Amino acid sequence: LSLRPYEFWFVTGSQHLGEEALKQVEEHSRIMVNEWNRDSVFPFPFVFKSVVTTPEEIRRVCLEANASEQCAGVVTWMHTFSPAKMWIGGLLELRKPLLHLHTQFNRDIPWDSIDMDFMNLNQSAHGDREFGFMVTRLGMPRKVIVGHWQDAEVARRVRGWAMTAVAAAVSRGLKVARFGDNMRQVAVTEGDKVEAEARFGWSVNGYGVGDLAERVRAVSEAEIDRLIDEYQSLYEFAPGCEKGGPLHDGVREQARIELGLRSFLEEGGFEAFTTTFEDLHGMKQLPGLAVQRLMAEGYGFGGEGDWKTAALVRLMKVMADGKGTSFMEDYTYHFEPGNEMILGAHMLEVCPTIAATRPRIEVHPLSIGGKEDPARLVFDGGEGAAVNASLIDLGHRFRLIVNEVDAVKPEHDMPKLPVARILWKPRPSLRDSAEAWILAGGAHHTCFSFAVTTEQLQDFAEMAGIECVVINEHTSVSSFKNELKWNEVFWRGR
Amino acid sequence: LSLRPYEFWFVTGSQHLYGEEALKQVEEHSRIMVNEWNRDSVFPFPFVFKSVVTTPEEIRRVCLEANASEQCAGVVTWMHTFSPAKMWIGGLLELRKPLLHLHTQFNRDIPWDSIDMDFMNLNQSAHGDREFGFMVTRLGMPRKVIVGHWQDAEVARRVRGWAMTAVAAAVSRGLKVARFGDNMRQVAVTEGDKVEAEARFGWSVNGYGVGDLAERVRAVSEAEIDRLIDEYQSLYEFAPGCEKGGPLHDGVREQARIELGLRSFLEEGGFEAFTTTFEDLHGMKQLPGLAVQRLMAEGYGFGGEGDWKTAALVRLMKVMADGKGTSFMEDYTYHFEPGNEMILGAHMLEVCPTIAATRPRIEVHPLSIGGKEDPARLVFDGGEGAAVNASLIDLGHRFRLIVNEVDAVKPEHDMPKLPVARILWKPRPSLRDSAEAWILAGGAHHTCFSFAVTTEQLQDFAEMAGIECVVINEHTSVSSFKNELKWNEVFWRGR
Amino acid sequence: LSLRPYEFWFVTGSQHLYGEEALKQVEEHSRIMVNEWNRDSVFPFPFVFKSVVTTPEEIRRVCLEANASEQCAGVVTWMHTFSPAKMWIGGLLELRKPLLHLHTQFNRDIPWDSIDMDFMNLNQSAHGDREFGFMVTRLGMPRKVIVGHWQDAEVARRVRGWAMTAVAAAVSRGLKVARFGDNMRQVAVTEGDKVEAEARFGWSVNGYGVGDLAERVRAVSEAEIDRLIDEYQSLYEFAPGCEKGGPLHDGVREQARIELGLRSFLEEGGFEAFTTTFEDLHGMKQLPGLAVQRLMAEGYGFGGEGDWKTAALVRLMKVMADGKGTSFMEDYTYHFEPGNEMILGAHMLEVCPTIAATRPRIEVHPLSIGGKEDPARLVFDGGEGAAVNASLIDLGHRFRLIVNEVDAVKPEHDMPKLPVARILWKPRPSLRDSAEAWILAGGAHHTCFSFAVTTEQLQDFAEMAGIECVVINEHTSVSSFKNELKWNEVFWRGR
Ligand SMILES: [Mn+2]
Ligand SMILES: [Mn+2]
Ligand SMILES: [Mn+2]
Ligand SMILES: [Mn+2]
């Protein structure tokens, strides 16, 4: 699932206090931007925009940055002193993520060269502080990275942020197609699409399942054959799911459902969607392998109408570069002292991008939805550092909840388990993470990711103006409880 | 649509200072009072007297009982004597039922002749009801306060007004709403938080696939269509081509189908309101039209394009109105004729016949919207008189109830080309100002219009549900209204 | 001082999506769990299985029953399966009983061989509980959350600790406090708002003149004194002068007289806590002393000088402590010996013998304070080990519970000229920092000292009551703590 050619504008501040210094500032910036496009750490193209010098110049490049659908964020560096009142109109206008790069062109103080002319020119030490003030003063969410522009860690911090900014750009235009209403009587998948569209840009809208049913009925048995070809190209088949076997019908249906979905979603420029098993009129099966393959392509998905998680999965997939990110649900607990684990799955819908094992197409009965035995990819999830993120609506506001977890390889086979699954050990413990999660009103539905950092989901939440609360090795429940209370008083009316 | 046999618990507060005999005389007064009110037997909901409360345990048990009692629509509290109000804290903190504080007195007049420390000791409501007043205000509880002698008629009118609001509230707490399809796509004001709504009003709002209604209408007996088309004929004129064997009696048949499949679903689930969306009618011959208007008539809430907020409100307001003169309504177009400025309200089809001046007429007309077969609908002219046009919207953090007082006017000219039931109103204070105030209140295009709900009832409901009620009437000026929106915003946030 | 036969309601949530037999599996899992938890007299409060709740009406019924039940001290909810939480909103909104969300699972371990969707459909708590977790948070209602397998020992300890908090909470709800006299004049911290206290904690705090007490103390017969003296002899050492036919014994007997009058008065009114004031002892021979220590040992709350908050807090903490290691206490003087900094805790007379390490000794000594006759009191050395020192103060707009974690220490040195029961502790983290943190928090000089009540139980009680709980322990930094106070203040305002 293709991105738009997303670029970050490097904006360098000065004022007027000569043209010769202004051109030294300019080449410094261009050099920095040119060597960033050639450092393999920096994930999207940086564009030198201007040395900005005047209010009208600051405001123009900020207006330009809003209108530029390809501008994902703006990186500001005050090379010289840049009297920050000049910046007010621009910053008031800026609505693209902001990195304040607090840097210096030169790394070391030239101890014998150090003169008033050098100092007059390389002023960021204070020029970035005066800008710091102005951005803090207007209450604006921004990223602040301090270091020499060549620094390896600066590089790593800047790209982590850049992935987040790209996730936010996709967020601004993000169209979510829901095929059915929320699973009846369910609270946490409910919330305010208007707030969500105001807060995150998400477009979330209902299509009757009729409208998907209609477009699955319109797929050629020919085009199903092309896709089965490419299923044989990718996936193991369970005895009876390969060509001719008694269950391959089921696989064909999911290939049908898959291609009807891709058609609907590609037509409407949707990057995420939800289904609801409670409403499967005109569908042979609850979508499963179809969804699993669409998530792998880079599509957000949420079960039982869960547009928040659907959107969250697309965004985190954008943050992760497509890798090791799935829709996820906490299905059961392994409480063994010393080996406490959560088994994470869904009815069918786990993205193969988290798979440790080569995915296998299987067909098994699924009571839930009263439809035909769904085909689905079955795998063991990978191992290592991951985040389990839920975005809930508290009514007045959204709260992003991120749990740091360690996914573990199953030691034991689960041969009667018909769904792809992942085992994780939540930090700081099952007992404590689950408790902090529940107190935070974390959903059952999460986006799980091996490739999104805590810092990225925090930066995303900063960009969107929502609370993000993190459960990890350092979380204690008493301290967490208090952080919820204090965040609440900060975040109400914001 | 039957109400539960809702009742109203009279609770009379006293202490022990005065004795057991005073407490019997207090019980007697209270029973005479409840008994007179019930004899005047026209009012649909009885007052059930609940023995005199004198202890925190007594106060607390009745308030727990009242909470459990599905019949209990509200509690009417009266301090006959000083009933020291700290006693009431346990009860008041338990009470989740609409409270009326009836600030009354058994005798009307100071019996100047005989008035002695015995009478002053027994007829203490003057201070008793104030002591209780402080306590209810201190706990930040919403209550109605009706002051006057219990036999006063304005007391009767205010209490009955409130009781109808209390019963509407009670319907609200259990209110189940079926949604056939999602909101009309890209629409804002019909969108909202169903969890906030359930928490705040008790409405259960859950979506059923349109297929779930289509399956139910496919099952509707070609025969039972026939038995209903018989009821149609009995009630409603048929437009030429729509009656008996005419080339559009199918349209009417297909609405009787939908009417019976809708009612099957809604009766099965105990649903007292529903929503349809023209954007999702897979398995339907027509957008429910005649079907929906009939269902509104017998008391169902309805909202179009998945508008559950208005569906619930149409339901609540229909219950407040005693089933009468209450409809789902949309502002469709304006008459801007200076001195004759009016709003024409309709919907594509779904206008309740309970607001009809002219006997409704089954007609079938094309409807582009939805790309389905020519829907049958009842067409009629709305009544006239004082009415309320009420929107309930989701500001994101809380709900706002917006009531515009309007005057529905008998139409001067015919709208013979207009295939939908319709109504004209002049909104107070003016079209210019109401519509401006309405827009600044962010009022929906979807409303419940009612000839029978008072402003005071919708305020009373808002107070009961702890939501802002903004009212646009003859006294509204936009400068003030704006300020009141700003000051209300600061009071209502996180409540 | 007997408790109601309090019980905890285990409520299991499911629905219908897996069938009526999957519901029987759930019901049988929960019955096992409840039976297993009741099995031994492990605990004075049983768990009661409440049939699985699967509908809004079921969930509302059990929460309404829970509230109405005087025996039900708390509800323990567990989502065995997905139990869509909109169903729970109506229920949760009614529940004014301590909620513990037990996030558990019937099986400890994933049965790796057999785990199939029959199993993943039934043991879904991993998500069931989170969906419920969201609803409870969303309603912002206070709850304990305990994760862990139901047979896990840590789970049992926590559930037992919370259970004791909830019973204390239940006692708080009907807690009746008698004040014999008003606040000590000009004292601030013992002052507060009895109305806010009733609303937030459930305490009925009311003033008797001491005449009421003296009167009842006078009506005590010389024979009831004689029988209680005989009980004193069996329990306590009499100091030389204090035994029958000693010159001081009359002082003891007058304490015996006060103990009997007080007990009569307190039992008559169902009072479980009381206050005296040395400033108002008209009709009394002595400041109540031995009598008060005795009444505290029986489980009564006491606060001196009209301190009803502490009195109530002492009753609550005694219930939490299961009547053990819990007294009214005051900070009397400081040992500032560097390396050996400790607080000497006492009161004029009123220290509960339940914190006694040594056999309490009836002593008669002069007491200037109140200008009455040489009161008899139990004198003893407080126990040693981990303890909490709790002040509940009124900040004006809300209560604040302050808990200092201390280490009671055996006195190295005799204090043979100190006529009062006393205890030493080392306040955590240091005398320097605890006293500073305590002063910044406005901690009272009057505390409930307890060997048995844990920081988490009081924190749990605070959660329950919706008041700030501030804890000073080994982890406390005075800089961090002043910020926690500012931030707490902002949250707790208007709540
Ligand atoms: Mn799910
Ligand atoms: Mn909301
Ligand atoms: Mn409409
Ligand atoms: Mn004292």
Q: DSSP assignment of A401-465, as one string? A: EEEEEEEE--SS--TT--S-BEEEEESS-HHHHHHHHHHTT--SEEEEESS--HHHHHHHHHHHT
Distance between CA atoms of residues C393 and C399, nearest Å: 6
Query: How remote is the C-alpha of A2 from its chain's centroid?
Result: 15
Locus of tokens 């079921």 = C58
Way the structure was solved: X-ray
**Are C297 and C350 in the same domain?**
yes
Distances (CA, A) of A420 to A301, A380, B258: 16, 6, 43
Residues B113-139 as b/e (b if ≥16 CB within 10 A, e otherwise) read: eeeeeeeeebbbbeebbebbbebbeeb
- The set of residues, in sequence order, having a beta carbon less than 8 Å from that of A454 and lying 6+ positions away, is A387, A402, A404, A470, A472
DSSP bridge partners of C390: C403, C448
Q: For residue B422, what are the domain limits? A: 175-495
Whether residue C136 sits in one domain with residue C111 = yes
Q: Taking CB atoms and an 8 Å cutoff, what residues of chain B touch A206?
A: 181-183, 185, 277, 279-280, 306
* Final residue in a domain of this structure, among A155, A173, A191: A173
- Smallest CA-to-CA distance from B435 within B406, B466, B455 is with B406
- Count of residues for chain A? 494
Q: Which of C72, C194, C198 to mutate to test the interface with B (most CBs of B within 10 A)?
A: C198
Query: How many other CB atoms sit within 10 Å of the CB of residue A229?
Result: 10
- In the reported structure, the alpha carbon of residue C174 is separated from the centroid of ligand 2 by a whole-number distance in angstroms of 37
Q: Distance (Å, rounded) from C-alpha C380 to C-alpha C358?
A: 6
Separation of CA B311 and ligand 3 centre (Å): 12
User: C4: which DSSP letter?
Assistant: P
Residue A433 is which amino acid? S
B/e letters for B223-255, b = 16+ CB within 10 Å, e = fewer, are ebbeebbeebeeebbbbeebbeeeebbbbbbbb
Residues in chain C: 495
Same domain, residue pair A128 and A42: yes
Give the distance, in angstroms, between the CA of residue C207 and the centroid of all CA atoms in the same chain. 22
d(CA A122, CA C126): 56
Q: Is A35 annotated as a binding residue?
A: no
Choosing from A141, A173, A205, the residue where a domain stops is A173
Q: Among residues C384, C307, C317, C390, which one has the least CA distance to residue C348?
A: C307
DSSP letter assigned to residue A381: B
What is the rounded distance in angstroms from the CA atom of residue A184 to the CA atom of residue A46?
Answer: 47
Distance, CA B154 to ligand 4 centroid (Å)? 57
For residue C304, report the distance from its CA to the centre of ligand 4, in Å.
5
Q: Which residues of C touch A342 (CB under 8 A)?
A: 126
Return d(Cα B210, Cα A373) in angstroms, integer.
23
Chain B residues lying within 8 Å of C206, measured CB to CB:
86
Q: How far is ligand 4, taken at its centre, from the CA of residue C251, in Å?
A: 22
Among residues C152, C174, C196, the one where a domain terminates is C174
Do B377 and B441 fall within a single domain? yes
Q: C195 and B138: CB-CB below 8 Å?
A: yes
Smallest-distance ligand from the CA of B196:
2
Joined together, the tokens standing for residue C432 give: 């320097």
The whole-angstrom separation of Cα C283 and Cα C370 is 12
Phi, psi (rounded to 5 degrees) for A62: -70, -45
Whether a cis peptide bond, with omega within 30° of 0, leads into A428 is: yes
> How far, in Å, CA of C164 to CA of A196, rounded?
43
Taking contacts as CB-CB distances below 8 angstroms, the residues of chain B near A211 are: 280, 282
Query: B257 with B193, same domain?
Result: yes
Domain count for chain A? 2
Contact state of B195 with C138 under an 8 Å Cβ cutoff: yes
C371: left (phi over 0), alpha (psi -120 to 50) or beta: left
The rounded distance, in Å, linking the Cα atoms of C495 and C486 is: 15
∠ CA A142-A143-A146, nearest 5°, is: 135
Stated as kind and residue range, the H or E segment containing A89 is: helix A88-93
Positive or negative CA dihedral for A98, A99, A105, A106? Answer: positive
Q: What single-letter amino acid sits at C191?
A: E
Strands lying side by side in the sheet with B47-53: B47-53, B7-13, B72-79, B99-103, B144-147
Contact C435, C406 (CB under 8 A): no
Residues B154 and B277 in one domain: no
Among A336, A415, A443, select the one facing C134 at the smallest CB separation: A443
Give the residue from chain A lying closest to B195, CA to CA.
A187
Residue A58 · residue A93 · CB < 8 Å = no
- A113 plus A159 within the same structural domain: yes
Question: Are residue C161 and residue C245 in the same domain, yes or no?
Answer: no
Cα torsion for C34, C40, C41, C43, to the nearest 10°?
-50
Q: Based on the fold, state whether residues A230 and A255 are members of the same structural domain.
A: yes
* Residue B445, CA distances (Å) to B140, B328, B331, B404, C211 in order: 33, 11, 6, 12, 70
Nearest partner of C1 among C287, C266, C234, judged by Cα: C266
Q: Is B112:B138 a contact under the CB 8 Å cutoff?
A: no
- Across the beta sheet with A98-102, the strand order is A46-52, A7-13, A71-78, A98-102, A143-146
Closest C-alpha among B162, B175, B151 to residue B392: B175
The answer to whether C56 contacts B96, with C-beta atoms less than 8 Å apart, is no
Contacts of A444 (CB under 8 A, 6+ apart): A188, A329, A330, C82, C126, C127, C128, C130, C131
Of B191, B210, B283, the CB nearest to A194: B191
Which positions in chain B have a beta carbon within 8 angstroms of at least one beta carbon in chain A?
Answer: 179, 181-183, 185-186, 188, 191-196, 199, 204, 206-212, 214-215, 277, 279-283, 306, 394, 396-397, 493-494
Chain centroid to CA C284: 30
Q: Do C86 and B139 touch (CB under 8 A)?
A: no
* 3 state SS of B431: helix
Amino acid at C150: W
DSSP single-letter state for residue A364: -
Contact A88, A138 (CB under 8 A): yes
Q: Left if phi > 0, otherwise alpha if psi is -120 to 50, otherwise beta: which for B322? A: left
Are residue B141 and residue B258 in the same domain, yes or no? no
* CB distance C134 to A392 below 8 Å: yes
Tell me: do A375 and A487 sit in the same domain. yes
Task: Give the span between the Cα atoms of B126 and B132, in whole angstroms.
Answer: 11
Q: Say whether the peptide bond before residue C360 is cis (omega within 30 degrees of 0).
A: no
Strand ranges in A192-323 using DSSP code E only, listed in sequence order = 203-207, 236-237, 272-275, 300-302
Give strand pairing partners of A344: A330, A422
All partners of chain C with 3 or more CB pairs under 8 angstroms = A, B
CA distance C495 to A395: 18
DSSP single-letter state for residue A273: E
Name the binding residues of C for Mn(2+): 305, 330, 347, 446
Residue A406 shares a structural domain with residue A309:
yes
Burial class (CB in 10 A: 0-12, 13-18, 19+), B2: exposed
Pair B233, B245: CB distance under 8 Å: no
Whole-number Å distance between alpha carbons of B40 and B196: 40
* Nearest-angstrom CA–CA distance, C98 and C95: 8
Of C397, C381, C405, nearest to C458 by C-alpha is C405
Token look-up 């990223």 returns A143
C-alpha distances in angstroms, B232 versus A242, A315, B2, B243, B484?
A: 58, 54, 22, 10, 48
Q: State the Cα–Cα distance between residues C421 and C341, nearest whole angstrom.
A: 20
| Tokens read off for A278 | 């409670």
Annotated binding site of C: 305, 330, 347, 446
What residues in A contact B199, CB-CB < 8 Å? 395
Structure tokens given for B438? 């309405």
**B326 closest CA partner among B382, B381, B271:** B382
Single-letter amino acid code for the residue at B213: L
**Chain C residue set in contact with B, beta carbons under 8 Å:** 56, 64, 67-68, 86, 89-90, 93-94, 96, 135, 138-139, 173, 194-195, 198-199, 202, 204, 206
Ligand nearest to the CA of A191: 2
**Per-residue DSSP letter, A3:** P
